[PDB]
Every structure is written in structure tokens, then in C-alpha cells.
Point group: C3
């Protein structure tokens, strides 16, 4: 069981109540108001406002 | 590998063809017509009509 | 931890840059422009244009 990340996509994300950006994370899904990322072994939901998707 | 749940959100869900509600479950994703929940070690997709999302 | 597939749904999917169809895969989620499938132990995101969802 493994969640293959969207190729050529890295995300920097801001956890609630912390201005420091974390990453780079892998993008697993992109919704209307949030995105799913995998930071190493942690998969989290991040509102788009707290995400910086970066193409490659 | 772990799916971190949406904080301050618990869901009660109705499996197809069973009126009894199950839960409380953790909310992992919220779409237009369905929601993703994690009931212990089981992650399932539940139509919004069969879900009771409860904020905290 | 397990991702229960949408019942009565099998998907055939085309990986980017390969015309050969793979499957059958299990449907885990259905979005606006893409779908989430599980091909054995691999969970991938597939644009709807590269997916053949088949009801049962
Ligand atoms: Ni998983």
C-alpha cells in the first residue's frame, strides 16, 4: 500500500497557528479549498491558503 | 505512512443498506457529494447523505 | 489502515506517456478532473481523460 505522488509537484505548507513554512512535501491530491500532501511519512490536509504548490 | 485527520471534526456514518449509525469516526477529506472517514483502521468513502459531520 | 474501495466499480487507467491500458483497478475516489485508484498495492491519481470507470 502506497500513495504515489503527483509527478513534478512539490508543496510547502503552513500548519495552523504557525507562520513557519514546512517542506518540501509531495502533492497527493488537489481539491477546491484544500490539498493533500505527504511530508515524509505524514499525510495531511492543508487549505489552499496555507499551501504553496510549485511545478517542475 | 499515516493519514492525519481534520482537527476538531468527528463523523457518524451510515453504511449502505443499514440504518444503524456507526462511529465516531475521524474526518480525512470532504468532497462535494461524499466524505472520507477513518473508523479505527478502516478508511471508507461515505456519501454526504449518509454522513453526520460534527464540529468541536 | 486500509482504503476500502467504492463497491461495484472497476477502473482501467492509462499512465502518462503509455497508450497501453492497465487494470482492472479499484476506485477509491472520484473528483472533478481526476480519480484515485488502487492497482494492487499502488494507489495513484489518474486524470479522468486517462481513466475508464466501469460500473457493475
Ligand atoms: Ni494510506
Amino acid at each position: 500500500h502506497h500513495h504515489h505522488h503527483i509527478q513534478n509537484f512539490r508543496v510547502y505548507y503552513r500548519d495552523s497557528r504557525d507562520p513557519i513554512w514546512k517542506g518540501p512535501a509531495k502533492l497527493l491530491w488537489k481539491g477546491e479549498g484544500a490539498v493533500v500532501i505527504q511530508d515524509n511519512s505524514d499525510i495531511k490536509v492543508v487549505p489552499r491558503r496555507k499551501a504553496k504548490i510549485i511545478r517542475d
